[PDB]
Amino acid sequence: CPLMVKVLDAVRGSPAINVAVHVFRKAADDTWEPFASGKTSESGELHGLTTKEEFVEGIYKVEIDTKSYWKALGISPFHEHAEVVFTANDSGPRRYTIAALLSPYSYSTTAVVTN
Amino acid sequence: CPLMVKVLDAVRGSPAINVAVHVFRKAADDTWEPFASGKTSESGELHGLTTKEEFVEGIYKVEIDTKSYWKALGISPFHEHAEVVFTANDSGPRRYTIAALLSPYSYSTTAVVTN
Amino acid sequence: CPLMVKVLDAVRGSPAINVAVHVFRKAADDTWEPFASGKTSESGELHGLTTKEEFVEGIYKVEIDTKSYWKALGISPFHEHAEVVFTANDSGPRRYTIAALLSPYSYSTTAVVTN
Amino acid sequence: CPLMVKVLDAVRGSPAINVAVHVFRKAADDTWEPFASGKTSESGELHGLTTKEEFVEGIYKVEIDTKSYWKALGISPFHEHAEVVFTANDSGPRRYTIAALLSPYSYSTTAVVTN
Ligand SMILES: [Ca+2]
Ligand SMILES: [Ca+2]
């Protein structure tokens, strides 16, 4: 599992469950091509987005649908989504965990990169 | 001044100075069109991006060039940039401050919306 | 004004208004003695805590009463308070801003130290 | 394992390894009594601090020795430590994960509380 996403809810102190995540990869013509998508589990984690073979070098965009998360809980949030854009695998394959911490008017995102 | 951007550096404990910031507004055909841009000042702030007349309701993207900031300091960063995407909504007088707190492998962003 | 405190509310996207803040200085016997205190203003800021003459080198604790803030908003919080503990060091002219970003189950704090 | 601590390094995008953590519990005379201590592993996690039987109701302080962490990496940080203070088990036993995200001049802490 070379790409994992973990999302927490800073209002409830809980995993953010059922958060939709869409991953895109920049194509040779500079457009964002759809790459993988999924939703966070009861643990706030999303595994199985991609494989070592498919997850080649490139610029990737991880779009976390924070607005739909808050709206489903009856909350009108500020952001449309949280976007995380990064070059991956430039020095060979790595494992990436993209974490996000959500509040209605704020979020944080951190990358943990391991070899 | 209905839209301000403030950027802080969590490694040096300082304003993030001379950071390029580009603002886009979502067009009818779902493309991002340039709206305003600048570089943060010595206080990490970018004022005068738009005016009340120009800053109508819609979806805006604030792209902060974090990668160039870290590279100018000789520090290896994770993200290509930090993106903040939000809907501006008219509900009484509103001023939007988009704050960002930068680390090489993490950032947070918060919206301070006041009257 | 060598020491300022700024507090933001990540749930409402606003300054955190009327938050009690207590500053302590570490005494010779390793106890915390009261040094300054106040409540944040309508802009979430607390100025005028100390003076250059009084704010000598040493270890300081800034205790932010986050629990009372959330309870006044009818929101259930995790922490008893947020504590920020740091050494003030004289290396040229220095101004310290202690910023805090509050959510019910999470907070961040950053030091902005400028000349 | 009713109390776990996880620490990440926002400069390196890595677990924060070998971070000392000291836990205290407020005694009946209002002093902070030592409760448990440990260090984070190669994964940035600290397990085994306490047991369900020992981890009774109370006010707990989790002190994360961030300064020694940064100093051992050759970095002079701002904070002495990161303190996390909370009432535990008030509505019956819960499992607490205290996460911290470290930068030299900033940190965040979040609590994930599960039943
Ligand atoms: Ca390459
Ligand atoms: Ca009880």
From Swiss-Prot, chains A, B, C, D:
<keyword id="KW-1008">Amyloidosis</keyword>
<feature type="glycosylation site" description="N-linked (GlcNAc...) asparagine">
    <location>
        <position position="89"/>
    </location>
</feature>
<dbReference type="GO" id="GO:0070062">
    <property type="term" value="C:extracellular exosome"/>
</dbReference>
<comment type="function">
    <text>Thyroid hormone-binding protein. Probably transports thyroxine from the bloodstream to the brain.</text>
</comment>
<feature type="binding site">
    <location>
        <position position="45"/>
    </location>
    <ligand>
        <name>L-thyroxine</name>
    </ligand>
</feature>
<feature type="binding site">
    <location>
        <position position="108"/>
    </location>
    <ligand>
        <name>L-thyroxine</name>
    </ligand>
</feature>
<keyword id="KW-0813">Transport</keyword>
<dbReference type="GO" id="GO:0005179">
    <property type="term" value="F:hormone activity"/>
</dbReference>
<keyword id="KW-0964">Secreted</keyword>
<dbReference type="GO" id="GO:0006144">
    <property type="term" value="P:purine nucleobase metabolic process"/>
</dbReference>
<feature type="modified residue" description="Phosphoserine">
    <location>
        <position position="43"/>
    </location>
</feature>
<dbReference type="GO" id="GO:0042562">
    <property type="term" value="F:hormone binding"/>
</dbReference>
<keyword id="KW-0732">Signal</keyword>
<comment type="similarity">
    <text>Belongs to the transthyretin family.</text>
</comment>
<keyword id="KW-0372">Hormone</keyword>
<keyword id="KW-0795">Thyroid hormone</keyword>
<keyword id="KW-0963">Cytoplasm</keyword>
<keyword id="KW-0597">Phosphoprotein</keyword>
<comment type="subunit">
    <text>Homotetramer. Dimer of dimers. In the homotetramer, subunits assemble around a central channel that can accommodate two ligand molecules. Interacts with RBP4.</text>
</comment>
<keyword id="KW-0225">Disease variant</keyword>
<protein>
    <recommendedName>
        <fullName>Transthyretin</fullName>
    </recommendedName>
</protein>
<feature type="modified residue" description="4-carboxyglutamate; in a patient with Moyamoya disease">
    <location>
        <position position="33"/>
    </location>
</feature>
<dbReference type="GO" id="GO:0044877">
    <property type="term" value="F:protein-containing complex binding"/>
</dbReference>
<dbReference type="GO" id="GO:0140313">
    <property type="term" value="F:molecular sequestering activity"/>
</dbReference>
<keyword id="KW-0622">Neuropathy</keyword>
<dbReference type="GO" id="GO:0005615">
    <property type="term" value="C:extracellular space"/>
</dbReference>
<dbReference type="GO" id="GO:0032991">
    <property type="term" value="C:protein-containing complex"/>
</dbReference>
<keyword id="KW-0301">Gamma-carboxyglutamic acid</keyword>
<keyword id="KW-0765">Sulfation</keyword>
<dbReference type="GO" id="GO:0007603">
    <property type="term" value="P:phototransduction, visible light"/>
</dbReference>
<dbReference type="GO" id="GO:0003105">
    <property type="term" value="P:negative regulation of glomerular filtration"/>
</dbReference>
<feature type="binding site">
    <location>
        <position position="6"/>
    </location>
    <ligand>
        <name>L-thyroxine</name>
    </ligand>
</feature>
<dbReference type="GO" id="GO:0035578">
    <property type="term" value="C:azurophil granule lumen"/>
</dbReference>
<dbReference type="GO" id="GO:0042802">
    <property type="term" value="F:identical protein binding"/>
</dbReference>
<dbReference type="GO" id="GO:0005576">
    <property type="term" value="C:extracellular region"/>
</dbReference>
<keyword id="KW-0325">Glycoprotein</keyword>
<dbReference type="GO" id="GO:0001523">
    <property type="term" value="P:retinoid metabolic process"/>
</dbReference>
<keyword id="KW-0034">Amyloid</keyword>
<feature type="modified residue" description="Sulfocysteine">
    <location>
        <position position="1"/>
    </location>
</feature>
